[PDB]
Design a protein around this ligand. Structure first.
Ligand SMILES: CN1CC[C@H](c2c(O)cc(O)c3c(=O)cc(-c4ccccc4Cl)oc23)[C@H](O)C1
Ligand SMILES: CN1CC[C@H](c2c(O)cc(O)c3c(=O)cc(-c4ccccc4Cl)oc23)[C@H](O)C1
Ligand SMILES: *Cc1c(COP(=O)(O)O)cnc(C)c1O
Ligand SMILES: *Cc1c(COP(=O)(O)O)cnc(C)c1O
Ligand SMILES: OC[C@H]1O[C@H](O)[C@H](O)[C@@H](O)[C@@H]1O
Ligand SMILES: OC[C@H]1O[C@H](O)[C@H](O)[C@@H](O)[C@@H]1O
Ligand SMILES: *[PH-](=O)([O-])[O-]
Ligand SMILES: *[PH-](=O)([O-])[O-]
Lengths: 813, 813
């Protein structure tokens, strides 16, 4: 008896075979016994939670079977360390991946409820800034769908990326209290809390180095399940929360200082801010993550790289290299050389930008007092690494200074990217053009030393959330000709090329875009009382505000469209609704000025009676994942106009392509590969290429030359300077004008002419609905290469050494 | 259809008819779907949580039916405002009150688990300091058992009363992270959050006063169910949590300043510390509580007192009087006189102490800047109140100065007790002697003005937790002769007097005490590796450390016992294990010195070979509700030796009586009434009475007179002064000695002789087990008057105007 009796404790049978009667039963139970409510006081929100909990049961049932399966099989495990995971909404995603959607729709319907109304109660889990954070989220969805034993590790921020409010045309920041009503998907794990150390000092006893006199901060994990598509695999995303360890009153209040580490996500995108709190956050997630990994590995180290793969999402968790060394040498007492071997073979680094001001260079004075032992370990790694460089290039002292992990100057700094390259067995770019730039520019030296380390892994988006979820209409007209296999094998959309001349398909593609455009216009009016003509070309640019992303270039074109209608008021032009959305880092002046200019322009354009509904400029407030799932499926033209060579890859570009929009962009990042897949004849490429940018830099960029040679451009600048877009404050945009004229690192003027002319070609094709639609079909049909399933499959095979699999596990019962 | 379909959403059927098969089914479900665990990684803690959640379902089912019942019936509602609620453990209490104990025991047993091991995983919810907080908790249990529509309102402190650690014989404080693993009984209610205002100013517009420019702090309620005994009534305890309202990073971090209000419970017992954070806490709970009340009342004000009763647990929530006035006058715009009428008729005040240093007197300068409008309203109430006094006693200006709510001096202060008396329709003491003292001393003036307002409501404890729960053995031997009716009608224990000469009952009473003593000794050894002789008289004094509670007097007796054994080493003495436990307010020097003396004494006594097991002094570390439920049932002698007139009532005294221990105490608080109920011949009363204390104060207390006249006392003092109990630091107790000799406000020396002689009488009776046991039976049988059911019944009938009821509601299904 005894222990044998506990065998009754089994997931054996769960909340149901996945059908209406049982779903309704559990919905009722959760509404009363979980939310402590009844049908008389229950609000739609209470009803959304009851459905979320009901659906979560089915998820957990598989979550448990999956982890049990991993413990038994013991596959090599993959850990994706990221300081960001932009997850978005979970209810619908879960229902879709688990095939619960239809049954849940019926169950709620029978209970006198509307599921879509319920689904809309859920807001985003915005623990990310944008591209980097959302890539991680797409990766999590893909690894689960590919049957990989992967874990996402990050920080559980109390407040994610701020909510953007537009006041008087300016961005205002409001904390994103995403946990106000709780989070039904996560599961706190206090029983697994681990300690993280800070400050202290290092003493060298007779048997090694000891990091003593430190301050401790606990890391409590919160687990979130990530369901693969219909394979019954549910992986985990473990996020750490900071806790203080365990006069009198003030001492208890001061416990807040330690828990401040996981309070808020730094709202910077592609920019480095050397703040100690940020450094604490990076080591916080790293220290706790590696403990959890080595522990999970234990329940000697020669086989560590065979069972463990740690992927560094940018340099943010780079401290993982000296930490893993610290643990192996100082605690496990492995000899240095063996520890290092294990370390390099375990880690791999992914770079996401080439812009200098985004790269992390921590002052050593900050590292010596906060993580003394790590600074020591880093110097040693540096000395040994440089010794190898010296050996491979005798006499090349200059190369030694260039590759050193240490930068000299008034302020000594540690170049975290160099650290990542040294301690990683693989370094990879996120787009072919980006990966090549890394090999001939910023990382040329390292590439020359270890060519074998450098790879490329072109980004991708998950077709689940970014097609099946956000664009059900498109997903169904597609499914009715080629089936549903494409959903987890996107390269099958290639079959659609067989319908480029099919009248029924052309009709359906255009009708779905129009329904989406119609639906989006009804959403804008509803929540923001904003009107937009649905029978106009939806010109959309949504991404974070950046000088490099050149929202300003888009602004110049808008005013050019406006001026042209004022010059020839009665001439016909294809109606346009230009939409620009995105947030600016709070401290990014130019970015905030750019947002004001956009609204300022809309203020003039939108109220000019002569213009009417021929042109409308709208700034989409609070752009986020949930909004992207809304506006992107209703887009016609996708703006991807970053200066050639500045956008590592981009993913928004991919979202638009899969959703029926045509692209106008530069030969930058993945734009290059999307054009290659669809054919340049089906794309709208324009402007300078990387070479043209470089040549201009050699001779020198003089924006005045373009000003003096382009009349329409002169007029626009004169309007901005004049106070034409700010009558009550004539010099309001003086900062934007001077930047463009004398300090524009992104050459907006240099691409203006080719940009406007290319925009003319867009309107031309739009005037011909049938041809426009047909070109779109050629795009949608060639977007398969950009499925995150493809990207993860490569990481798995070329970096992690694990074979992807679509094998499905049996349902819980 | 439609709305009619939602009728399917019902509590109709719940987790089970209250039997094994279904209990096991839900235990399994919760273990996997709620805790996300499986039988392979599940720890006893995970198993305790699975059982707690399983049991909670049955509680919630009734919780929902009860509130639905109240909305339909619309009875007058009773709100018990307290800054403290010392609840303790909930699992067993719930199982008992719901009659789930046996079935749950069997279900767990069948699943290969031990419920008692599981129950011991649960720790206290120590949101209280001691007596006052635990009285509220007993009151909550009783109101539910008496079928009253009552709500407990307080603050949800992140950290309750600190955990006490003894290091080097001294008390060390450690934050009580009671929420580390979560709380399965509460239910957060973010959807019911309310705003609380602070600071600001008052401007007087043409239509009234306006409190503007304030700072806002949100109050989010967390509901906890309180089950009555087998009547299917589950009331609510709603506790408020502080939340901040909704550069950039620092602004988000600073949100901690607002949430600090509900961070920690001030650890002071019977002492006032005029800290702004404390004042914020008092208004925090008051402001949010009254909003919730008026709101619940709305879903004109002449009938407010007919549907609402607000009971002020001490002066802590006294701001409820000016707040209710503020709301009625400033917001509801009622004329002053009508508002006041409604206010007095709604509120009632309970006083818990006569000691001056416990009474709240807030400096006006603190009130004007923090709650300006309330200071204004208070002055107006004062002027109008004094005008009435002036009218009732013309020319008595001195009485005006004495009764004023405002105290003049260098530092102007508001006497909160006077405020409570003025704005309450009833004021009550917590014990007959206490209530009389209030009428002839500190509140004589007010009593003279409004004799009708003053009442008495003798405290009481709940027989559920304090007998059926903590002492199952006693509860069963009692149940086998008179049944179980006494459980909710304690006056039935009177029937036991019929067994004072029954050999079987005498045998059983003594055997149960011995089993408890045996069990307690096994608990002490287990967790604290402390040994105690179970065949010795268990002399126990557990309560907070206070000079007034005179733990020191007990210390003098212990050393007297020690010295006597050293004087006549071979003379026989009844073996004793003296136990003293309790916490000292962190800043209470004397109290901390008293704790050290106790351990210091144990250090000498416990290691003296000549003494051996004839005497053992033990300091019970971290005394709390859960420990009280352990040590009290194993006690033989209950120490209640406060100076006559200082202990308002006491409740520990009541706990011991109901559990089979004899009492040695002064004629103080409820000790007076317990002796009256059992008969002084069955009690051990000693020392000065209130009159004797007062006479000594008239002529003057000279401790040297007792020192010079009592040889044994001189010896003890000489030992303390000598360094006999602190050889490494001879003058360590100089503070205790000097206090006793020259500044002892509690006259420990004055009661020493009568105390020791009375202790001689105790040992005498113990030498005769049969007679001791028989006296105990006379105590247990006369403890019925001290059931909190009796106390709540009186409040209900004499103050709240609601009739108590034992009518049971139908089970959820
Ligand atoms: C000279 N000065 C200009 C502004 C810049 C700066 C700030 O002062 C504050 C910020 O929040 C940002 C930001 O988010 C992104 C970028 C950035 C990033 C990549 C390429 C070019 C730029 Cl300008 O720059 C920022 C920094 O102080 C250097
Ligand atoms: C003169 N001085 C003595 C100590 C006293 C004091 C403190 O400085 C600090 C404290 O934490 C307490 C406490 O908890 C209880 C009592 C108290 C309560 C009732 C009766 C008698 C006393 Cl001494 O007094 C405290 C205050 O400063 C006045
Ligand atoms: C996909 C996504 C991004 C990335 O957009 P890019 O144009 O590649 O920079 C940014 N923000 C959100 C909300 C996204 O969904
Ligand atoms: C009942 C109780 C008290 C009250 O004890 P008194 O001796 O009346 O002061 C204090 N603390 C705890 C833990 C209690 O259970
Ligand atoms: O790789 C994910 C993303 O990282 C950064 O946001 C880059 O700016 C972007 O080009 C890339 O797509
Ligand atoms: O009324 C509850 C308790 O309040 C205070 O703690 C008093 O010290 C005590 O005598 C009383 O029993
Ligand atoms: P069960 O033991 O989980 O199937
Ligand atoms: P049901 O409508 O709760 O019984």
């Amino acid at each position: 008896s005894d222990q044998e009796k506990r065998k009754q404790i089994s997931v054996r049978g769960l909340a149901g075979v996945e059908n209406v009667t049982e779903l309704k039963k559990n919905f009722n139970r959760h509404l009363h016994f979980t939310l402590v409510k009844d049908r008389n006081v229950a609000t739609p929100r209470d009803y959304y939670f009851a459905l979320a909990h009901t659906v979560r049961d089915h998820l957990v049932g598989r979550w448990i079977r999956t982890q049990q399966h991993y413990y038994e099989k013991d596959p090599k495990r993959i850990y994706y360390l990221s300081l960001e995971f932009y997850m978005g909404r979970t209810l619908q995603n879960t229902m879709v991946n688990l095939a619960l959607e239809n049954a849940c729709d019926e169950a709620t319907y029978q209970l006198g409820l509307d599921m879509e109304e319920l689904e809309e109660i859920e807001e985003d889990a915005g623990l990310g800034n944008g591209g980097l954070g959302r890539l991680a989220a797409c990766f999590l969805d893909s690894m689960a769908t590919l049957g990989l034993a992967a874990y996402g590790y990050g920080i559980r921020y109390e407040f994610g990326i701020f909510n953007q409010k537009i006041c008087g045309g300016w961005q205002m920041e409001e904390a994103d209290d995403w946990l106000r009503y709780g989070n039904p998907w996560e599961k706190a794990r206090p029983e697994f809390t681990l300690p993280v150390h800070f400050y202290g000092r290092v003493e060298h006893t007779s048997q090694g180095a000891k990091w003593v006199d430190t301050q401790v901060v606990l890391a409590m994990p919160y687990d979130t399940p990530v369901p693969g598509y219909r394979n019954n695999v549910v992986n985990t995303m473990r996020l750490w929360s900071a806790k203080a360890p365990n006069g009198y009153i003030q001492a208890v209040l001061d416990r807040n200082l330690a828990e401040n580490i996981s309070r808020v996500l730094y709202p910077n995108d592609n920019f480095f801010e050397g703040k100690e709190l940020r450094l604490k956050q990076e080591y916080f997630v790293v220290a706790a993550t590696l403990q959890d990994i080595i522990r999970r590995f234990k329940s000697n180290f020669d086989a560590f790289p065979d069972k463990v793969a740690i992927q560094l999402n940018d340099t943010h968790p780079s401290l993982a290299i000296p930490e893993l060394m610290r643990v192996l040498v100082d605690l496990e007492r492995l000899d240095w050389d063996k520890a290092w071997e294990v370390t390099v073979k375990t880690c791999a680094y992914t770079n996401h930008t080439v812009l200098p001001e985004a790269l992390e260079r921590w002052p050593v004075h900050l590292l010596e007092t906060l993580l003394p032992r790590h600074l020591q370990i880093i110097y040693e790694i540096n000395q040994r690494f440089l010794n190898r460089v010296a050996a491979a290039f005798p006499g090349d002292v200059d190369r030694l200074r260039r590759m050193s992990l240490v930068e000299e100057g008034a302020v000594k700094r540690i170049n975290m990217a160099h650290l990542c390259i040294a301690g990683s067995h693989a370094v990879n770019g996120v787009a072919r053009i980006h990966s090549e730039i890394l090999k001939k520019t910023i990382f040329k030296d390292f590439y020359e030393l270890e060519p074998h380390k450098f790879q490329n892994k072109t980004n991708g988006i998950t077709p689940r959330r970014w097609l099946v979820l956000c664009n059900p209409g498109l997903a169904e007209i597609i499914a009715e000709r080629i089936g549903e296999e494409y959903i987890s094998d996107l390269d099958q959309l290639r079959k659609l090329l067989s319908y480029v001349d099919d009248e029924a398909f052309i009709r359906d593609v255009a009708k779905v875009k129009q329904e989406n455009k119609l639906k989006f216009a009804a959403y804008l009016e509803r929540e923001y009382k904003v009107h937009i003509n649905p029978n106009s070309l939806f010109d959309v640019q949504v991404k974070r505000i950046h000088e490099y992303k050149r929202q300003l270039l888009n602004c110049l074109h808008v005013i050019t469209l406006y001026n042209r209608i004022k010059k020839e008021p009665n001439k016909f032009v294809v109606p346009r609704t230009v939409m620009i959305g995105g947030k600016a880092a709070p401290g990014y002046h130019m970015a905030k000025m750019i947002i004001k200019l956009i609204t300022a322009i809309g203020d003039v354009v939108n109220h000019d009676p002569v213009v009417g509904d021929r042109l409308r400029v709208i700034f989409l407030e609070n752009y986020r994942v949930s909004l992207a799932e809304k506006v992107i499926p209703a887009a016609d033209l996708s703006e991807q106009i970053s200066t050639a060579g500045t956008e590592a890859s981009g993913t928004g570009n991919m979202k638009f392509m899969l959703n029926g929009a045509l692209t106008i962009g530069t030969m930058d990042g993945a734009n290059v590969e999307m054009a290659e897949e669809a054919g340049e004849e089906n794309f709208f490429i324009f402007g300078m290429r990387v070479e043209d940018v470089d040549r201009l830099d050699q001779r020198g960029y003089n924006a005045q030359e373009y000003y003096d040679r382009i009349p329409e451009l002169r007029q626009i600048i004169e309007q901005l300077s004049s106070g034409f877009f700010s009558p009550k404050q004539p010099d309001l945009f003086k900062d934007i004008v001077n930047m463009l004229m004398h300090h524009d690192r992104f050459k907006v003027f240099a691409d203006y002419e080719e940009y406007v002319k290319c925009q003319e070609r867009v309107s031309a094709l739009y005037k011909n609905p049938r041809e426009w639609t047909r070109m779109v079909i050629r795009n949608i049909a060639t977007s398969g290469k950009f499925s995150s399933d493809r990207t993860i499959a490569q990481y798995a095979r070329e970096i992690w050494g694990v074979e992807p699999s679509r094998q499905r596990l049996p349902a819980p019962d």
